């Protein structure tokens, strides 16, 4: 218990050896505590900022989904989604919360992915309204199914 966890702490710090030891130790301990990591790596998370998973309650099978995420390691997210297949909603929410939408988020989500539930989930990730999605549908080109980005960006060309 206490002795072994403190052993792990000590080994990690004696692995780093910073200069401002108090501040570095503070930052290290805080990052180990919270899931929120200040490094905040994207496109290959390595740091589960799983606020989406917290909203999900497990994103399906919690153990299995987190196992897939941990075994994952743009390209890394694509590989993770390939290995996986709900879960797709969690993956898209991760690729969004690690990014900043400029319609590039939508295009990249489509590429990593048949493009309706994606936007439906991505709306909730803002914590907009479904009327925006309805307007996008009214502006939707190639409405037969999964549109292409260039084809669909016809009426709503100037969008965020």
């Amino acid at each position: 218990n206490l002795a072994d966890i403190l052993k792990a702490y000590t080994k990690e710090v004696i692995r780093r050896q910073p200069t401002d030891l108090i501040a570095f130790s503070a930052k290290y301990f805080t990052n180990l505590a919270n899931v929120a990591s200040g490094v905040s790596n994207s496109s290959a998370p390595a740091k589960e900022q799983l606020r989406q998973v917290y909203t999900r309650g497990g994103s399906g099978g919690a153990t299995l989904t987190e196992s897939q995420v941990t075994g994952l390691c743009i390209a890394d997210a694509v590989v993770a989604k390939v290995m996986e297949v709900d879960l797709s909603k969690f993956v898209f929410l991760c690729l969004a919360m690690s990014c900043e939408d400029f319609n590039r988020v939508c295009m990249g989500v489509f590429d990593v992915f048949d493009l309706l539930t994606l936007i439906a989930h991505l709306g909730p990730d803002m914590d907009v309204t479904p009327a925006f999605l309805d307007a996008v549908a009214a502006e939707l080109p190639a409405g037969g199914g999964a549109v292409t980005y260039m084809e669909l960006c016809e009426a709503p060309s100037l969008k965020p």
Binding site: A3, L6, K7, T10, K11, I14, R15
Partner: protein, 56 residues
Amino acid sequence: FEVEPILEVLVGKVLEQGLMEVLEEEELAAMRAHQEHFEQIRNAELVATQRMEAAE
């Protein structure tokens, strides 16, 4: 009158163990870097060796 001895042994053995283990692990990883490098060079020379053997 509990802090002194228990924490003394704890901190002392832990710090000494870390100071030894970082040393040893870094040295062994350097050794493995050595082996990877020369084995890759010899593996290129060995595909050349395969060309040697299949030359006849």
